[PDB]
Design a protein around this ligand. Structure first.
Ligand SMILES: Cc1cc2nc3c(=O)[nH]c(=O)nc-3n(C[C@H](O)[C@H](O)[C@H](O)COP(=O)(O)OP(=O)(O)OC[C@H]3O[C@@H](n4cnc5c(N)ncnc54)[C@H](O)[C@@H]3O)c2cc1C
Ligand SMILES: Cc1cc2nc3c(=O)[nH]c(=O)nc-3n(C[C@H](O)[C@H](O)[C@H](O)COP(=O)(O)OP(=O)(O)OC[C@H]3O[C@@H](n4cnc5c(N)ncnc54)[C@H](O)[C@@H]3O)c2cc1C
Ligand SMILES: CCCCCCCCCCCCO[C@@H]1O[C@H](CO)[C@@H](O[C@H]2O[C@H](CO)[C@@H](O)[C@H](O)[C@H]2O)[C@H](O)[C@H]1O
Ligand SMILES: CCCCCCCCCCCCO[C@@H]1O[C@H](CO)[C@@H](O[C@H]2O[C@H](CO)[C@@H](O)[C@H](O)[C@H]2O)[C@H](O)[C@H]1O
Ligand SMILES: CCCCCCCCCCC1=C(C)C(=O)C(OC)=C(OC)C1=O
Ligand SMILES: CCCCCCCCCCC1=C(C)C(=O)C(OC)=C(OC)C1=O
Ligand SMILES: [S]
Ligand SMILES: [S]
Ligand SMILES: [S]
Ligand SMILES: [S]
Ligand SMILES: [S]
Ligand SMILES: [S]
Lengths: 421, 421
């Protein structure tokens, strides 16, 4: 309302949860902050692959949101938005109720575009997903069924995927778990299928020796790897794969039987957001400026996977660059800062800063991680790390982030670089 | 004088030059700041190996100090201190003149302890040094003499050395330059001799895959490598080497003819500092507390290679951990802050922060670099990088640091991490 702006955060994920806390902290008691999300629980998504192989469980990585945000004076509505009317500034929820906003911050993350590959939906066939805890649990269930009746395994990443690390991680921990159960020899074939132009390209033209290290990794586990692939369909428990060369010319088609599979899907924007006229690009990602403000609606901001970021390269099979946590948090920070500025008469000048990608993968005893920035080469930082210390770092960070999500954020969040001072 | 403390910085190196600027900035016009150093010029020491192979020249990496510090109101005396009387607080210069201080900040760096290995002094035989520009020029001169009359090459690091990166860098660029001149095949043998327990230990138990990468590097250049070595003497143009196993038992002695050689020497504290009663450990390194304050004299502080840092491991042949630039600068910052606090009645609480090592080596087209912290494993960061981007980074940093040394520092110096914002 006038004099007392009502700010709505859509989506309680890696960007949205911090956003709700940071917004309430920035605005204070004279403004209503409302968090709206499709689930009543937060989940730490980097841990989903471990759930998918049975090394973690839901209770380890997920917790109900309501109590934690509400003790901070944030209103919480555990309902999916089905429609957004940007003219009236009304959000229609799944139950038919509608919520008005003065400012809207979209943090709705990815729509998992299984429809791109007919039959690839986890409820449609043997190719599963570890992108969410619901899917990871379903993946583990199918993994156990594999254990009862061993057959070919196929793991990898679809055309248009942008999040490749988890495919490599999952393949490695599946290989590892299989050996631990004394079952690895019962698997007739173990194949890795990716849209990357080469192993370890990772949607970012590689980082450090990611190519050499990931290639060696898969070879060590006896995993046969194919790049420049797209899957045209999953059908009759078979994966239909088309492989091209650099020039896009088909060099072979394959038909792979799949007893147990997991392919990272391509991401699009969620339908309620994509469905806002003039808001998004054709992929359904919010078109924003450097201040995280929508190009069309001055009072709509966005952060996280939901925003559109232009590609800097094009690969034989379409792939995308990932949007990762440190950069997501810089977007959230900018958006919060600039909404507050707006509320006080100014155009906020804060930006996301420099593009970067950071990822951590834990194989059990040892981890792998990378930092790349900026997006185009030659970079200012381009580093790949491996070792026990990396595993310890992931474990520590998960523990930290989950606690922060329960306790609340102020907060120039990454003061977790104080490990220097 | 009372009410107007006189602060003296001893040594105009990587720590001392920033220190003089930062001290004057912190204290202002009501206090005299005096910089005293053995040379009238600053040199960028990471570039010395390139001077040693003729890829850089003195004028590229060195410049006269006087004009630059004096325009900042800093007094400059281009004279070695020969004696320090900590009771009277008088420094006796080489010319007999004496300078009084109220606070003294020691930044005198290393004494190159050639005397540990009889015959190893650069003016005594064929084993040269690239630790200073004077030595690097002399090394290049001897390199050209090698070119006229090819013979065995021996490069590496003495027992007690703590700065290993430059030995690897120098060996690599020497190998590289030799091929460029079409002369590499004229060299009968090319040997790398180190006190490290293994190749790429680097006085810090390795970092990232430093062992694998450096081993492969030397092998590619046809350089034969020997670890766990100490040199007992250089004589008759031969290097006498003793090699032990893990337990310190001699497994062989070698006698290597040397036409052209370069061995990183062990570091001690400079004689004027070591000679202060109760100031230093037996190595001649200043015993300081966490605030960079001398344990004995409340008004003596120290930073850089000059301070004593306890070892965390012991290797078959004694080696030390390096003291590198980012940590040196944190020491300088702490010392400046705490001297100012003292001047204003308080005990400053600022510390060096977390131990870390950072190094950059440039091989011409591509660089190598590492970050390790803290000192003991498992670390929080333990990363090794290689590539063209690393070469570009070194070139950029050298250019930046030299400019800053001419323009002056305020300054939370490493805001050069703003490449993020
Ligand atoms: C398996 C996997 C591993 C990853 N590992 C890393 C890593 O090691 N490091 C790193 O920095 N990044 C990692 N990421 C990438 C990234 O950081 C995450 O995907 C992160 O969760 C994205 O944050 P987000 O806020 O944009 O989207 P999300 O975290 O997916 O949150 C989006 C949210 O909004 C909701 N929502 C969607 N539609 C609606 C609607 N119509 N109405 C209401 N709510 C809605 C969701 O239910 C959800 O809570 C990983 C991603 C995956 C899939
Ligand atoms: C070949 C080489 C390569 C290196 N590369 C790197 C790198 O890539 N990254 C990194 O972080 N570090 C690097 N270092 C390590 C380190 O950072 C440097 O050695 C650095 O110069 C040390 O700073 P300092 O102020 O302690 O000593 P120095 O820079 O040696 O300065 C000491 C100074 O005080 C003086 N002095 C000595 N005695 C007296 C006296 N009695 N009276 C007056 N003045 C005196 C000197 O003449 C000199 O100016 C390298 C070192 C070497 C030798
Ligand atoms: C987070 C994003 C990244 C993608 C997800 C994960 C990818 C899968 C990881 C495969 C790694 C397997 O292969 C592993 O790699 C490294 C090579 O650097 C080797 O390790 C080597 O370098 C490391 C340091 O980095 C040293 O500590 C080690 O002593 C050395 O042998 C391991 O001996 C090998 O077992
Ligand atoms: C600064 C402190 C370090 C010590 C000083 C310098 C040590 C000497 C460097 C020797 C390196 C030589 O060997 C070189 O190493 C790397 C291995 O990671 C290889 O490079 C490999 O990883 C890099 C990324 O890190 C990739 O970009 C590259 O495509 C891949 O092949 C090079 O193909 C090889 O030529
Ligand atoms: C120098 C520029 C890069 C700074 C990044 C520092 C690394 C800190 C942890 C990285 C991380 C982030 C940010 C993160 O958001 C995240 O969750 C999605 C992780 O997974 C466990 C991470 O490992
Ligand atoms: C995360 C903790 C480590 C931070 C270090 C950031 C790297 C910036 C440059 C490093 C560097 C420093 C500090 C430095 O002082 C120095 O000169 C001795 C270099 O040689 C060229 C360097 O490459
Ligand atoms: S990734
Ligand atoms: S590439
Ligand atoms: S990631
Ligand atoms: S080093
Ligand atoms: S070690
Ligand atoms: S270094």
């Amino acid at each position: 309302m006038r004099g007392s702006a009502h700010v709505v955060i859509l989506g309680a994920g890696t960007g949205g949860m911090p956003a709700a806390y940071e917004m309430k902290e920035a605005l204070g008691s004279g403004h209503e902050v409302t968090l709206i999300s499709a689930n009543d629980y937060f989940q730490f998504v980097p841990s989903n692959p471990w759930v998918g192989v049975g090394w973690k469980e839901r209770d380890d990585i997920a917790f109900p949101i309501r109590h934690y945000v509400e003790r901070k004076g944030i209103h919480f509505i555990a309902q999916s938005a089905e429609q957004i009317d940007a003219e009236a500034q009304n959000i229609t929820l799944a139950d038919g109720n509608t919520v008005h906003y003065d400012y809207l911050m979209i943090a709705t993350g990815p729509k998992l575009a299984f429809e791109n590959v007919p039959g690839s939906d986890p409820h449609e066939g043997p190719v599963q997903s570890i992108c969410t805890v619901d899917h990871a649990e379903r993946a583990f269930a199918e993994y156990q069924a594999l254990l009862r009746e061993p057959g070919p395994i196929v793991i990898g990443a679809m055309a248009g995927a942008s999040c490749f690390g988890p495919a490599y991680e999952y393949a490695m921990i599946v290989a590892s778990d299989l050996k631990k159960r004394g079952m690895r020899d019962k698997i007739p074939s173990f194949t890795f299928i990716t849209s990357e132009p080469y192993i370890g390209a990772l949607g970012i033209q590689g980082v450090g020796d990611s190519k050499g290290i990931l290639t060696k990794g898969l070879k060590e586990e006896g995993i046969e790897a194919y790049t420049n692939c797209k899957v045209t369909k999953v059908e009759d428990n078979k994966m239909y794969v088309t492989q091209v060369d650099e020039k896009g010319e088909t060099i072979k088609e394959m038909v792979l039987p799949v007893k147990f599979g997991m392919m990272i899907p391509a991401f699009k924007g969620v339908p309620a957001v994509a469905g806002v006229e003039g808001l998004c690009n054709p992929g359904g990602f919010v078109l924003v400026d450097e201040h995280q403000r929508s190009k069309k609606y001055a009072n709509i901001f966005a952060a996280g996977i939901a925003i559109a970021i232009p590609p800097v390269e094009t690969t034989p099979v379409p792939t995308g660059a990932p949007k990762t946590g440190y950069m997501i948090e810089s977007m959230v920070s900018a958006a919060v800062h600039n909404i507050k500025a707006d509320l006080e008469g100014r155009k906020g000048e804060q930006t996301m800063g420099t593009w970067n990608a950071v990822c951590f993968a834990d194989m059990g005893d040892r981890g792998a991680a990378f930092i790349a920035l900026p997006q185009l080469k030659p970079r200012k930082v381009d580093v790949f790390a491996y070792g026990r210390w990396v595993h310890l770092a992931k474990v520590a960070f998960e523990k930290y982030f989950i606690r922060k999500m329960k306790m609340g954020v102020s907060e120039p969040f990454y003061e977790k670089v104080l490990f220097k001072m």
